[PDB]
């Protein structure tokens, strides 16, 4: 038993992290096959003024790069720029490249972040992409290029995130491996601000099922609500729509409680917990996905 | 910025996890040099009655073991029993044994768990050893033998925990690599219940400093209480004593807030936040050490 936000193991991703340096600027990259992908920030000139990346790219010289894995330097063959990332062709392939694909996350998706500094991983944690296209992680100077990944049920690594910048608000912004910044934020300092976060209803439903399976049921509500009604309430109260109901069948069967009864319970609990808690939480928890709850409680995939 | 409970990267430990089978029973072991350490539960008979491990060990037959790392079959040369673990000598040394030591944890220590099933890692998360010598993890059937570790600055891996059992209460119990069970709980099913844990005051102070440094200060009390005063209050309210304000000097300086002001805040907050949160937590958090907070937020040591 227990429900804890965890990361999928990081070994296969650690073996792909590299240190990328251009002039004095250092950040992290990901080495897959004969290509290193990293944020284009690495070629920015030192200045406080707006960076013109097209000009930075045109004045770029290959000899200014150094790329290394565990202190072993790689030859740089060529560099191209794609959105907010660089693709650096190197002169040998990573022999420890995992079976992998590239995936662009959608809000509500869980993934793992490997926080790296100077091409060496320091921490790994699970995180959710928020409705405002940011995450809440923990990064300090040098974390740029820290990768996000998921490992599919079949073992394939999905590469989905490269850390780009922290907004003034503290929100964390990354791009996918194609260079598209999640939420269309600028990949350089600015005054941009993310939209207000919405609670992930699908995850709250999963959380309440976990609570029921632990004998915590004081909060169950007997009012009638359907998905359409809940979704209208959600829009008015800072919650996402619930996506669907049937996917919860494994948990609905184990508990005898329908998703619609949980939706009614969310509406009630919005009023307050009146000093009580659910699995130790004093407010609704949207940290855990359905997949996570089923995996952690029953050891199976959906 | 940010503060998030993370795990240290798991790669070097994944390379030491093996599948250990005895008869139909499968669990996890840790392969270092030519020895695999695993919980002695692996040789228990299938029963609901009390297990006599001395008898089980006396009747053990080496041929019944199957030990493997990723399809690499390891020949069993001999087995000895030490407290709650077996040391299985195998015919091959793990050439990926990391620089390591064995370390016995004390309450308040943070470490990492690699949750494994059938010799394969599934998740990694950080935990903190409670005053009752249990942890709050997430484990289901098959997790026995999942290792806990901490990586020192010089890269030395401290192997500190092997998962043993979940109590009826849900608390998680493990042993060290010498075979001593943390808290001296029984390593088989029983009606044992862990003693009540105390909130780790030193860790809460570290957490509140982290909150301040991340701009979260709604909870900050306007008054102060001295260490002696807090300590008398703590004894009556299920908190550990705070010993010295001096170790907090660096964060007190960065924030302009004294430990005494944080201690007064704790007293006001010890029953909950209502519906509010601090760094995503519904109530006071004692999961982070001072060293952990400083390392994560400033990349330095104490």
């Amino acid at each position: 038993s227990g429900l804890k936000k965890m990361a999928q193991p990081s070994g296969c991703v650690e073996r792909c992290v590299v240190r990328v340096c251009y002039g004095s600027t250092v950040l992290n990259g990901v080495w897959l096959g004969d290509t290193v992908t990293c944020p284009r920030h690495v070629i920015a000139p030192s200045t406080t003024v707006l960076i013109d990346y097209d000009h930075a790219y045109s004045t770029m010289r290959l000899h200014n790069f150094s790329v290394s894995h565990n202190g072993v330097f790689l030859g740089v063959v060529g560099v191209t720029m794609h959105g907010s990332v660089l693709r650096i062709k190197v002169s040998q392939s990573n022999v420890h490249t995992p079976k992998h694909v590239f995936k662009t996350l959608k809000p509500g998706d869980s993934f793992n972040i490997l926080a790296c500094y100077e091409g060496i991983a320091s921490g790994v944690f699970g995180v959710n992409l928020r409705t405002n296209f940011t995450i809440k992680g923990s990064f300090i100077n040098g974390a740029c290029g820290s990768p996000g990944y998921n490992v599919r049920n079949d073992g394939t690594v999905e590469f989905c995130y490269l850390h780009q910048i922290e907004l003034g608000s503290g929100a964390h912004v990354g791009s996918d491996f194609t260079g598209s910044v999640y939420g269309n934020f600028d990949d350089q300092p600015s005054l941009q601000v993310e939209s207000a976060n919405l609670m992930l209803s699908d995850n709250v439903v999963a959380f309440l099922y976990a609570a029921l399976l632990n004998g915590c049921r004081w909060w169950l509500c007997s009012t009638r609500v359907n998905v359409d009604g809940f979704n209208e309430w959600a829009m008015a109260n800072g919650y996402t729509s619930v996506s669907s109901v049937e996917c919860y069948s494994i948990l609905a069967a184990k508990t005898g409680v329908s998703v619609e009864q949980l939706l009614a319970s969310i509406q009630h609990l919005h009023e307050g917990f009146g000093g009580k808690n659910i699995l130790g939480y004093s407010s609704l928890c949207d940290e855990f996905t359905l997949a996570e709850v089923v995996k952690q409680m029953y050891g199976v995939n959906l």
Side-chain angles (χ1 to χ4, degrees), chain A residues 4-302:
Chain A
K4 175 110 179 158
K5 192 68 165 178
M6 51 180 83
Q8 300 177 291
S10 59
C12 66
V13 175
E14 292 167 53
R15 298 171 191 119
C16 302
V17 174
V18 294
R19 179 186 183 264
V20 181
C21 172
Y22 188 87
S24 288
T25 305
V26 181
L27 49 52
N28 309 279
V30 175
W31 182 20
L32 296 168
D34 70 350
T35 301
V36 170
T37 303
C38 72
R40 65 180 178 172
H41 162 66
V42 77
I43 64 171
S46 295
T47 180
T48 305
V49 185
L50 184 75
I51 298 161
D52 178 342
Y53 278 106
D54 290 333
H55 178 83
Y57 179 77
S58 73
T59 63
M60 182 187 61
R61 297 302 180 256
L62 297 188
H63 76 259
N64 293 328
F65 279 105
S66 65
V67 179
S68 60
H69 182 66
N70 292 333
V72 176
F73 289 84
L74 309 175
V76 172
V77 181
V79 179
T80 56
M81 180 166 67
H82 307 268
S84 62
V85 302
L86 299 182
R87 290 182 182 150
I88 301 168
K89 180 177 172 171
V90 292
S91 63
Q92 65 198 86
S93 291
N94 183 358
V95 303
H96 304 292
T97 303
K99 174 175 52 182
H100 71 279
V101 300
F102 303 99
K103 183 182 183 184
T104 299
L105 297 156
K106 307 204 202 336
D109 285 352
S110 65
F111 65 108
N112 308 281
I113 288 286
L114 185 63
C116 301
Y117 298 86
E118 301 262 340
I120 301 299
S122 62
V124 65
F125 60 87
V127 70
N128 301 317
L129 187 65
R130 296 179 146 197
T131 54
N132 60 21
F133 287 93
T134 72
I135 64 174
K136 292 291 174 172
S138 177
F139 303 107
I140 57 175
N141 184 57
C144 194
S146 289
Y149 63 97
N150 265 315
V151 185
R152 301 207 310 219
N153 301 338
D154 69 18
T156 300
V157 179
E158 298 178 325
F159 287 98
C160 53
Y161 180 99
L162 287 170
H163 184 61
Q164 291 280 354
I165 194 169
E166 178 174 315
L167 301 179
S169 62
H172 296 127
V173 159
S175 69
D176 65 24
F177 275 61
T178 80
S180 308
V181 180
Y182 286 103
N184 199 37
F185 296 102
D186 216 329
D187 70 313
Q188 57 173 290
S190 74
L191 299 178
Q192 288 181 335
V193 54
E194 77 278 7
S195 303
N197 191 48
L198 304 180
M199 288 281 294
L200 300 164
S201 298
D202 288 355
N203 290 10
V204 183
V205 172
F207 170 75
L208 294 173
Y209 273 123
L212 289 174
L213 289 165
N214 196 67
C216 178
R217 66 190 298 112
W218 60 264
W219 43 267
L220 277 170
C221 183
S222 294
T223 63
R224 188 180 76 194
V225 67
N226 60 21
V227 172
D228 289 349
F230 175 83
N231 288 348
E232 178 167 301
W233 174 92
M235 293 171 190
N237 289 274
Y239 276 64
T240 59
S241 289
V242 61
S243 297
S244 58
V245 170
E246 286 295 290
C247 49
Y248 291 94
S249 64
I250 168 176
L251 300 182
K254 290 180 176 296
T255 63
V257 172
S258 71
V259 170
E260 288 84 0
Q261 175 163 26
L262 298 184
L263 297 183
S265 305
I266 288 166
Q267 296 175 309
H268 163 74
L269 283 165
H270 189 76
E271 299 181 17
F273 284 31
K276 298 188 167 194
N277 70 88
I278 303 176
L279 294 181
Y281 299 81
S282 309
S283 62
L284 289 172
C285 173
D286 79 341
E287 176 80 3
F288 299 101
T289 65
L290 177 55
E292 287 167 340
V293 169
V294 172
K295 179 71 154 67
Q296 287 191 39
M297 297 191 62
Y298 302 110
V300 297
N301 302 317
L302 303 174

